[PDB]
């Protein structure tokens, strides 16, 4: 009959079925299933992935790809490429809004459930990036 396919997971996790209180530093770099209550959610914000620019002097479209550390599970060498306003020859670039791609990004806070939390203690929470 282009976007790469993603994966979701279900089933028993065993020792990885945790709560925000039970999340510890031994669980870092591990797949964990965490149940709790959502207390805070952030504003849904677009994140620029590829910026498309137009050079009117040459009449050509250029583009630049941007990545951050949350996009990849494996770390990479951080190469921060600035937002291009020149081409390689010095011609002025104009941003082509609508040809650029923006991916929705959210951050939520998951606190342990008030029925699964101890009755006197301050609650523990964790940020989740979606």
Which among 3-11, 22-30, 81-89, 106-114 is the span making contact with other proteins, rule CB under 8 A? 81-89
Q: Which of 24, 29, 72, 88 binds other proteins (CB under 8 A)?
A: 88
Nearest distance in Å: CB 9, other proteins = 26
Query: Is 25 an interacting residue with respect to other proteins (CB under 8 A)?
Result: no
User: Of 53, 50, 52, which is closest to residue 3 (Cα–Cα)?
Assistant: 50
Q: Which residues pair with 43 in a beta bridge?
A: none
Is 22 one of the binding residues for other proteins (CB under 8 A)? no
Q: Which stretch binds other proteins (CB under 8 A): 9-17, 33-41, 89-97, 105-113?
A: 89-97
> Total residues contacting other proteins (rule CB under 8 A)?
24
Task: Yes or no: say if 124 and 112 are a contact pair by the CB < 8 Å rule.
Answer: yes
Q: How many CB atoms lie within 10 A of CB 44?
A: 10
User: Quick one: CA dihedral 16, 22, 23, 26, positive or negative?
Assistant: negative
Q: Does position 94 bind other proteins by CB under 8 A? A: yes
Number of Cβ within 10 Å of residue 93's Cβ equals 21
For residue 92, state whether it binds other proteins (rule: CB under 8 A): yes
Q: Are 42 and 108 in contact (CB under 8 A)?
A: yes
Residue with tokens 């941003």: 95
User: What are the start-end ranges of the H helices in 3-129?
Assistant: none
Nearer to other proteins, 89 or 115 (CB): 89
55 near other proteins, judged by CB under 8 A: no
- Give the binding range for other proteins (CB under 8 A) out of 15-23, 29-37, 85-93, 106-114: 85-93
């Amino acid at each position: 009959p282009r976007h790469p396919w993603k994966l979701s997971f279900k089933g028993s996790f065993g020792a990885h079925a945790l709560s925000p209180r039970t999340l510890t530093a031994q669980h870092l770099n591990k797949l964990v299933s965490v149940e709790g209550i959502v207390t805070k959610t952030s504003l849904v914000r677009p994140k620029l992935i590829r910026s498309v620019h137009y050079a009117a002097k040459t009449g050509r479209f250029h583009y630049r790809d941007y990545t951050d550390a949350t996009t990849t599970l494996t770390t990479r060498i951080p190469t921060p490429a600035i937002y291009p306003t020149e081409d390689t020859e010095g011609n002025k670039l104009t941003t082509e809004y609508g040809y650029s791609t923006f991916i929705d990004h959210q951050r939520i806070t998951v606190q342990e459930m008030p029925e699964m939390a101890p009755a006197g203690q301050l609650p523990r929470s964790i940020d989740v990036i979606l």
